Design a protein around this ligand. Structure first.
Ligand SMILES: O=c1[nH]c(=O)n([C@H]2C[C@H](O)[C@@H](COP(=O)(O)O)O2)cc1I
Ligand SMILES: O=c1[nH]c(=O)n([C@H]2C[C@H](O)[C@@H](COP(=O)(O)O)O2)cc1I
Lengths: 255, 255
């Protein structure tokens, strides 16, 4: 088992993952903020104030009521300044020819500013083949949804094993997974785990929480994705630090 | 076997499906046009010209380079004039509390203009439950993706069975399926099938095509979703009429 910093230097490491692994070690943060907000200003305020505590900011640019590409210009500014990756949670999940256009085009032009995006594997390997054609040119990485935190999730057993396989066979573009635990034995791949809170619980619509120590420590994931656990707190700065320190110590203990 | 007109009067049938099935019968079309264009003027020129030939227009708003809510207004006007339903192929595939926001809010405000939307079942029923909460107020309906057309598709066997159960258990809002064949024998559910062309073949990124006669005639589907088969033609109207006549005669032969 290697440190994040050692993993950033592996032969077969993808550059986007290496950049991420290096700033993870530098900042002592395996925390990804989920910024689920309705206003551009909200997003840029939060990113800036919490930037120092995170390795990655996960966006839903399709829930911004005042999206513009200038808003994402200013997001990249803050990303370069505080050193975090931008991860648009698009969950591309269609045939290759469609996801191509969705990734490069339309009003969002996701490929022009997202270091990472994710994709569901249900369509088969064409969803990644399609995304690759936009991603490789623009030096980007993708994450494959191998597991989900929601109750009734069908991403289990054979489905999970297919997501890993797909990943291993597209390593020039796929840098890791969305998962509830470590699912690949290859240290080149990242693991990011949503459904994370300090306290036991869920929400009213299928979400189920596990703690950072459980997820990073016992389940062997690398990064925790945390939204309401931080945004809904009174002190979002203090909240982000708690999750950072929890996930960071769990990682240290694991080494 | 019942006709679209009879099925539209079924006791346990959704207001949206009933509306759809009546205009199908009235207009003699079970063709959904997949308008995968990136200019609003071409979308509206196709909608206007091909309106009378179609029971439904399937959109990908997020690939339109010049989307405005005013464009959708004009699309709605054409849809009323020519009697077709608007279906946004958004493929909701996140947790319930997330998809609610993507469905209602943000720049696209899909719920305000889309008669139907679709969702993947991989997250568990929470995804349907989240969408339901927004759509039921507005009398919308939802299609669940039970099978896919592309090579390597993991929407098979128990995954499909899962989508059927989830649909049946949420009939108040799920009006049917995106699938390759009839997967539900319950006549209140609509079956819609993409990966359709007249000629045998496929594309370079996993898309596989069967004919209207195979899909409607042998596999028992209701409606064909056809993109490039029409869009790539010089005369898109002649092509639409060709797909319409093929799919409609295939339907009449099942009775
Ligand atoms: O399997 C998943 N689970 C999940 O929670 N998300 C997203 C949805 C939400 O925006 C965030 C979870 O944040 P909370 O910590 O607020 O639940 O991660 C995405 C996937 I794929
Ligand atoms: O399983 C699927 N298969 C599929 O083909 N589409 C959509 C994607 C595209 O917009 C259209 C196919 O267009 P062609 O008929 O040009 O392949 O159907 C959606 C799903 I879910």
């Amino acid at each position: 088992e290697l440190s994040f910093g050692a993993r950033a230097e592996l032969p077969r490491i993808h550059p986007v993952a290496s950049k991420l692994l290096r700033l993870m070690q530098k900042k002592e943060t395996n925390l990804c903020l989920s910024a689920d907000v309705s206003l551009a200003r909200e997003l840029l305020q939060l990113a800036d104030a919490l930037g120092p505590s995170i390795c990655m900011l996960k966006t839903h640019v399709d829930i911004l009521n005042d999206f513009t590409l200038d808003v994402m210009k200013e997001l990249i500014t803050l990303a370069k300044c505080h050193e975090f990756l931008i991860f648009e949670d698009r969950k591309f999940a269609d045939i290759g020819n469609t996801v191509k256009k969705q990734y490069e085009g339309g009003i969002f032009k996701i490929a022009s500013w997202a270091d990472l995006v994710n994709a569901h594997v249900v369509p088969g390997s064409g969803v990644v083949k399609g995304l690759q054609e936009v991603g490789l040119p623009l030096h980007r990485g993708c994450l494959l949804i191998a597991e989900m935190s929601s109750t009734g999730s069908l991403a289990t057993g054979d489905y999970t094993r297919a997501a890993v396989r797909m990943a291993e066979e597209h390593s020039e573009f796929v840098v890791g997974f969305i998962s509830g635990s470590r699912v690949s034995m290859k240290p080149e791949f990242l693991h990011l785990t949503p459904g994370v809170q300090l306290e036991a619980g869920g929400d009213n619509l299928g979400q189920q929480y596990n703690s950072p120590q459980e997820v990073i420590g016992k389940r062997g994931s690398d990064i925790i994705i945390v939204g309401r656990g931080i945004i809904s707190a009174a002190d979002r700065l203090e909240a982000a630090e708690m999750y950072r320190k929890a996930a960071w110590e769990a990682y240290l203990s694991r080494l």
